[PDB]
Amino acid sequence: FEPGRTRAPSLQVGGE
Amino acid sequence: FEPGRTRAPSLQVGG
Amino acid sequence: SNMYGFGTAATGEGSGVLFGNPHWYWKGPDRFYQAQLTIDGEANVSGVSFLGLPVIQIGFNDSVAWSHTVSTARRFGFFQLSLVQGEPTSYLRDGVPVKMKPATITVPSRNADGSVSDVTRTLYHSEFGPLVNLAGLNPALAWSQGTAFAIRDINGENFRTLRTWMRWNQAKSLDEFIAIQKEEASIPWVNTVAVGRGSAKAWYADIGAVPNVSPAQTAACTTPFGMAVGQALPNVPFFDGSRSECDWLTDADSVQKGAVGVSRMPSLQRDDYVGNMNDSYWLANVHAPLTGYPAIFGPAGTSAQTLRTRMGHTMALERLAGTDGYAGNKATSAVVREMVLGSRVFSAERFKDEVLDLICTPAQWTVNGAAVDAAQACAVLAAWDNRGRKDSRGSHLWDEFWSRVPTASLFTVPFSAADPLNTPRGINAAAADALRQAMATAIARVGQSGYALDAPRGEVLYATRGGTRLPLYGGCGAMGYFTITCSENDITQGGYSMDGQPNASNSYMQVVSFPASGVQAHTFLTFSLSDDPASPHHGDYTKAYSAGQWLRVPFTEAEITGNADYRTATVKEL
Amino acid sequence: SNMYGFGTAATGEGSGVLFGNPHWYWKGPDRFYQAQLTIDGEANVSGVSFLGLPVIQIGFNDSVAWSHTVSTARRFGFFQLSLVQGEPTSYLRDGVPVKMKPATITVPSRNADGSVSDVTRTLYHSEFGPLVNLAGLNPALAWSQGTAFAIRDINGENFRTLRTWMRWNQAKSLDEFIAIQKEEASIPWVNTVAVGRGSAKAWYADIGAVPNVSPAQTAACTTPFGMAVGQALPNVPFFDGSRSECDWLTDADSVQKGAVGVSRMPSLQRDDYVGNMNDSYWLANVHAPLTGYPAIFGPAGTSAQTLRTRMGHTMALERLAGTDGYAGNKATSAVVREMVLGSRVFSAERFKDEVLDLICTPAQWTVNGAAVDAAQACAVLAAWDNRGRKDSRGSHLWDEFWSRVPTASLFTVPFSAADPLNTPRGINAAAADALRQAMATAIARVGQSGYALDAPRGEVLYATRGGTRLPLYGGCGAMGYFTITCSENDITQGGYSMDGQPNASNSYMQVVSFPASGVQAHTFLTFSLSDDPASPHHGDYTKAYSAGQWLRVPFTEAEITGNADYRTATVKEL
Amino acid sequence: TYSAEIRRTTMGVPHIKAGNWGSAGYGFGYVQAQDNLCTMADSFLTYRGERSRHLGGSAQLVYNSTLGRPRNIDSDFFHRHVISDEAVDRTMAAQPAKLLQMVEGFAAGYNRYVREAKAGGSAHAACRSEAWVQPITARDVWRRIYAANLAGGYSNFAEAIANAQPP
Amino acid sequence: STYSAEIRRTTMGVPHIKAGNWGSAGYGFGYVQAQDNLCTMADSFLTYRGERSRHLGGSAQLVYNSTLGRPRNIDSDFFHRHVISDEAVDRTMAAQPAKLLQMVEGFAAGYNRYVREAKAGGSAHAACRSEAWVQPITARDVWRRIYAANLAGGYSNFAEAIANAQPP
Ligand SMILES: CCCCCCCCCC(=O)O
Ligand SMILES: *C(=O)CCCCCCCCC
């Protein structure tokens, strides 16, 4: 596993 | 190989 | 989204005031639609629905008024599945292979040449919910020959939401509203605040459908992948789908299997105020903080609050102290109406002076080896009123600057749970060069926009209707606005136009109270009722919003028929 | 892109006429920059370079003039690699393992908080070129335990291009120009058309760097994966990397290894005309089609020509026959300047009457069960001149309509190679409902855009400079325009604005001839010289383009110093 | 026999008055479509997974929403697989009688306006004559209702769910 | 031994560079291109050098469309570092005639001259003049750019796919 490759998704409903 | 999962790339320079 | 519930001690009258302020879409099917439903012997409800929804989701009746803001509480989890060797479409469960329910789906698709041809694939369910391609999250999370991943959303099995609004639409008091919420525990992804007639206490709750996992469980059940990805998905249970002791739990007062029980979900009653601006349940009321609720609901005093949260609570406190420049010290319908549109800017109020003192002497700079003349920027910002009103000058310069300030080591006074409105603070002197870099860029961006540094905001921030630009006020939560008018349009591309698809902004607004003669409600639907540019209701409401003229919405039969623009028509059929 | 080379027979005079019309970017580093380079006793050349390029790529000198269009000839290929088991970074060559060359690359990357951190990954080269991730092309084409994929571009080893233009810049005749092109065989991805002073014939060629594969190779070397995906990569060799016999070939007169030899690349000399509008070499001249060149160059008489190619050759022929409504039958400098901006619309000229005849009686319709008034649409289109000139009324309706017509058996006369300009043709009467569906939609789009159906094109199609919308003319190749002004903006988003990043459009234009007194060139740089909004040269050329006023670009010393806007200064340093 | 009185006041705010829940549904569905037909009709292609049929697989969703703007083809797969006939059945089975009546009316109110927009009028010129302005069913509204619930979970991973495929 | 170029401008600003040698022609040409198009160009030299992400963040797309299309900064960076390596530049330069190597050195020097001017003051290029990525370049960087132009028919079209090719 390589954390540098992680793409956090946006999890705020209605947000950006 | 499922031919319907193929996505054609951009092949026309400038297009 | 913001909301306030003021209680009778705050208003000094017989009932409280509800302020509902969802920050939401200006276009599309999720946009709000304002209407009243009068059903003989059943309901008299008014407020707002998503387009396509048949009951009122945010509004009021003769007896209660409520609103919603998106809650920090996570509403889903992942399940890591250990696949049967040789069989990628099957997963192990306590030692037994369990097959994934398939579904072969064919979707007709119009081709760029005009003809319509079928596209087909087979997708799968686990018992937890649908399979999910997590390669996007991280490439190591691909559906291998060894492991797969499925997502569960507790709302995927929540069939109680419509009835719950339906019953709220009918509710005859705050106590009844509360009991319905507790009975149904159905609220899918939002907080709730409500005020009732003759009731002294305002109501806050994050009582709804929420995954149920224990601290012992997340220690034992989180996989090595779930660990390595845990920070990208804060408080999202990323569990072992092979062991059943890892299934979501069910409390003795739990309404739905795998969901948190009613007594372990945060709520609060106050006679002064409750409020929420998208941070956790923690600070529903600043004077009486909430703690001791499941992790999944979000941080309870361990994270800095957003600038907007700091602004929203600050506004409430200063109203009740009588220090916000409005009359007296009560949260009356009339004052609340003005207050919520005032367009104060938290970052500017708290940090502008410090920034300017730090970087403006001298105002002639060397930034990235380049001569930069920041004298006009410095003077304009010093002169500016720290607001985003239509006639506020230089406010957009601040927006382009602040949104660009690096936040690593920006403050020297770190967040303190004992002082959540005033921390973090103290602009770091070591940040001076970076601040000058950001300001240099901001100046340049306003430069290409064609606007002057000191332009009034109303010329920068606008909505177009009938060929005319209506001046707007407010801004984005990142600058610590409470009044939200947040364009997605780059300043260089014609200013802060609200004509496209803006970011979550003021949409349906309501200030509701209960004087002796019956519910009064003052409302906005900022983008107007109709999406058709030919309709006379495409831009009328937007003109009122621009002018800051709250609509007193008629509610009683006498009010409806006595309205200056009253029209009626009947529609029948079968 | 378009270009014409007119011979002396066609001009009537002692020299030919060159028309250069690359359709290219309006913004970005690949945009053209117009300039003249005068190097003491060595070169005097004028025309255009990409930004960042030091020699002229499209231009002219006192002796030759030339231009380029993107060629149909493929310049790359894929190689499928048979991986060594247990070692996914090695591949087999005739049963011999070969190591892939690794490169560990670290790139610093700015994080959203302001700080900069290193991101690193090891990438690989094969003896064919870089390794390539084809999972996006098809997920079955991933880099697996046994299979990898590399891409070879013949220009990866082509270090001759810059040198070639430089030699062209200095060339003293067409003869020399041609000999240079042949010697270097370097032109990376474009056709070339040139005209010389004192030469009767105009030159066309697709002579440059092109991957060399045989018919025998294509049948034997294309892999099952190559077979399966060839339809999405037409004429692209997708060969077996395991077999040395599948390496690219080298002819006896190849300038570069693995590239097509000079005698097997298409060229033609004509004293009437040559032209290209992005179709294959085939119809460089309609009277003398070219055939028998390697398949990689594209089809030669098996494929219908684009609408733009049909327009371009039609314009050429109608000029020389004297039937296009300009004076005489000669391709003189002044007449070419007009015709190339004429803005004729091929689809309309050929099929509008057939379309209208078919669906406009009656003009009141039922489409998708809905009443549609098409009397305005039908009348506006009938009255429309079939051109996209500034004052052309209704042309945008046609754009919105034609681009939406389904082409699945729209025509009843199929393409014929003996009638390549006029086939396919003949509107299928059965398409009647589909055409009315297309027209209904077009009406609706123009409706919600705010433009009237008969609005003049110049109000719809524009470039903004100094806050004023300069009216434009021309359109998109899809409609069969030759004069290309093709916006990326949807008509509902404020018309066909050219202010963003439009699709390939008229950029640098030149009309060059060689009268007795010396070369004469008339030019446009449509978007203007400078990207800086504050520059005097941000919008001046654009204003001239809007007015259709070709610039006589000064070339002699006396012309330069005698120019009304002449300014000189000298820069120097150690 | 649905019957609703529609009262409009300043800014057009409608006030539906009916004797029963079904007829309230009728009046409410009517006014929503009357004011927002193009947004709504486009939205029913969305929840039914019929976007690609009319608008093309590779095109994105027109409007932003709790769904974001994924490709039509992926949205279509998402909604069919997650908002399946079984899910809609299961949703409906749990509903009280008056609410099932309301949704019925709502679909029928919507369909009424659709007929009217098809017949003529200068309203909704953007889309009134398009194929995807068409009647809908009570189930389709239930699709919409269920869809709004998933904003916190499935909706955020629509592209991802539609492309969950074994090696 | 000095670069020296006469810059003659006419209608529309069209520059006519007059020089005694190729180096000095390059100098004048590099200067005028920068004078008119600094922000586009400075941004472009990040692309070819693979230094976009450092300045503009890895997940943003290229600002401008080109033969490269508009991939993400991070991937563009790896593409260019990988394909337009130092070895690729060395090989490109080795094949050049002396006069062109001098022209490109002149060109970089001229570009750098205008960068010193923009940095010093004035109202031109107000959009980017104070940014860190407006900076001097080398002859090698111009060669990077030249090599990049040749790749449009092949590698440029698969930039993102080349940047992400790795074994399991
Ligand atoms: C399923 C619908 C959820 C509750 C409706 C309220 C939506 C408001 C969202 C927000 O607070 O920004
Ligand atoms: C139109 O399709 C082609 C125009 C682009 C030509 C670019 C100049 C030659 C550089 C290789």
Residue numbers in the entry:
A (entry chain B): 8 to 23
B (entry chain E): 8 to 22
C (entry chain C), D (entry chain F): 1 to 574
E (entry chain A): 12 to 178
F (entry chain D): 11 to 178
Text of the article:
The crystal structures of MacQ, both ligand-free and in complex with the reaction products of decanoic acid (C10) and phenyl acetic acid (PAA), were determined at 2.6 Å, 2.2 Å, and 1.75 Å resolution, respectively. The C10 complex crystallized in the P1 space group, similar to that of ligand-free MacQ, while the PAA complex crystallized in the P21 space group. The reaction product, C10/PAA, was successfully trapped at the hydrophobic active-site pocket, while the electron density for the hydrolyzed counterpart, HSL/6-aminopenicillanic acid (6-APA), was not observed. The C10 was found in a different binding state in each active-site pocket. In one active site, the carboxyl group of C10 hydrogen-bonded with the side-chain hydroxyl and amino group of the catalytic residue Ser1β, while in the other active site the hydroxyl oxygen (Oγ) of Ser1β was covalently linked to the carbonyl carbon of the C10 molecule. These distinct binding states have also been observed in the structural analyses of PvdQ in complex with dodecanoic acid. Despite the different binding states of C10 at the active site pocket, the two heterodimers superimposed well with an RMS difference of ~0.3 Å for 756 Cα atoms. No side-chain conformational changes were detected around the active site, and therefore the factors that cause the different binding modes of the substrate in the different active sites remain unclear. The C10/PAA was accommodated in the highly hydrophobic active-site pocket created by the side-chains of Trp24β, Phe32β, Phe50β, Gln57β, Ile58β, His68β, Val70β, Trp165β, Trp189β, and Val190β. First, the SP is observed in all heterodimeric units of MacQ in the same conformation, both in the presence and absence of ligands.
The recombinant MacQ protein exhibited bifunctional acylase activity against various ranges of AHLs and against multiple β-lactam antibiotics, including penicillin G, ampicillin, and amoxicillin. The MacQ protein is comprised of 806 amino acid residues, including an N-terminal signal peptide, and belongs to the N-terminal nucleophile (Ntn) hydrolase superfamily. AHL-acylase is one of the enzymes capable of inactivating AHLs via hydrolysis of the amide bond of the acyl side-chain to produce homoserine lactone (HSL) and fatty acid. The MacQ structure clearly revealed a typical Ntn-hydrolase fold comprised of a four-layered α-β-β-α motif45 mainly composed of two polypeptide chains, α- and β-chains, generated by self-cleaving activity.
